[PDB]
């Protein structure tokens, strides 16, 4: 949490942390089960626990809705995928670009279709490559 004044922590004894500044006016703060529970849960690969944990006292932008798109064998990634970019990312990290094309679509962009199409050729199957490559207009490739 933030206080409205600059301060020094007096020390931590108990759940509270206690502070006093130069003029020595106090601030106290209970250590919360907000940010702490969420990542204690994510570390122990729980996503079901973590959905409740998601609150607007700790949501931010990238600790819940896009920090969870940071596994090269998607786990966290599977859970938050709401952003068309996070969805795109998720797909190359699996190597299954079926989801990529859709994210790539929803990113409204050609570049994504050619790059996922190349990844597609890598998983081995060229039907998926054709479709992408056709709409990026790489008829010659």
């Amino acid at each position: 949490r933030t206080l409205d004044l600059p301060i020094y922590v007096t020390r931590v004894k108990g759940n509270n942390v206690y502070c006093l500044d130069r003029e020595c006016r106090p601030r106290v703060l209970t250590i919360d089960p907000t940010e702490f529970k969420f990542k204690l849960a994510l570390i122990n690969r729980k996503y079901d626990e973590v959905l409740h944990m998601v609150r607007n006292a700790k949501l931010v932008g990238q600790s819940i809705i896009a920090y969870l798109q940071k596994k090269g064998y998607p786990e966290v990634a599977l859970h938050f995928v709401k952003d068309e970019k996070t969805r795109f990312s998720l797909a190359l990290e699996c190597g299954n670009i079926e989801i990529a094309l859709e994210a790539a679509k929803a990113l409204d962009d050609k570049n994504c279709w050619e790059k996922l199409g190349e990844v597609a050729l890598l998983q081995g199957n060229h039907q998926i490559v054709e479709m992408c490559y056709q709409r990026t207009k790489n008829f010659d490739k």
């Binding site: 679509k105 929803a106 409204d108 709409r135």
Partner: protein, 380 residues
Amino acid sequence: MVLLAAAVCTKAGKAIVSRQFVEMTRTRIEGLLAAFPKLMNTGKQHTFVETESVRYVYQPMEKLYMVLITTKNSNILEDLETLRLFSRVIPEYCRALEENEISEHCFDLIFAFDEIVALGYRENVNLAQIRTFTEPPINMESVHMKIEEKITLTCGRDGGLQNMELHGMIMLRISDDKFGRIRLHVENEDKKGVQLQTHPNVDKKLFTAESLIGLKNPEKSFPVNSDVGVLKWRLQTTEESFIPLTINCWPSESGNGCDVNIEYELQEDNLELNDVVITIPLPSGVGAPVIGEIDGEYRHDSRRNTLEWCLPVIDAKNKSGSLEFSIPGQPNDFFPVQVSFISKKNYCNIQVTKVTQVDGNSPVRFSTETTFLVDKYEIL
């Protein structure tokens, strides 16, 4: 606009009086004039100097700059010339430039600015003008006729005709010996729209009944542009033109999603059209579609935000699709669907009843062909 603003400046660090032709540069006007004209527009005693990606043209008068600014340009002579005419007009109002006297005749100068440069285009002014305001082989003989036409249509969901128009010409290619006279007979046309052109060598005949046109054809192929309607005309599709396709669109609110059924109808079953495509648009919050069609291929295309159905050739046919939508906002009005098509008939209904040739024996009308093409064909 090419001319952002026309501005009189004091290099006190402010635009003393200035003109914004259309609401764009309000406060913007003062900051530009205030910084740049102080440095002589950053000039060196050169009339054109460009700074912060804006062309500044100027003339110093005292501690003041009379300034023209553009960020685009149509011609060299022009930018100077509006500034110049301005410089005839400004001492009439303010007796040279000077911030207090410029300030007092904001109205005068400003009005001149609107008059001089209107919507950024440099009009002209003059001190008197300003006043009003502040006051042989015939075995071979064969003939071929090709009628090529495009039809345009705008129609409502109701099926209201709205406007339509057909454009076309009938080209004749003839291999005939000698110079034979030919008479052409065609159906009678009407047109809400207008246009008809006749090739030279076309004669008009007046008959009590029926209309006739006669002409000696040029050999080879030429636009007949005969008389009568003509063999080069714009007829109105509205006037008796058939629209090969009618689209009946039934959108449905499945609830969260939307179900769209598109009905296509063709003329006589026997006739088949080719190159037909129906473009059914979709709303921005697309999700994904599932489309089903008995004939041809149909594909949804994001980006385009349209579902396109293509049919190589059709006796006549229909398609359906279900759409998934996230629902932001409220319901959206539909945009019109367009179609492309080819038909082996003319839907200006031009019929070649008879073309009889003389000066010799019967020629063979080996073939008459009709190519009908879609123009802007739109239905909501």
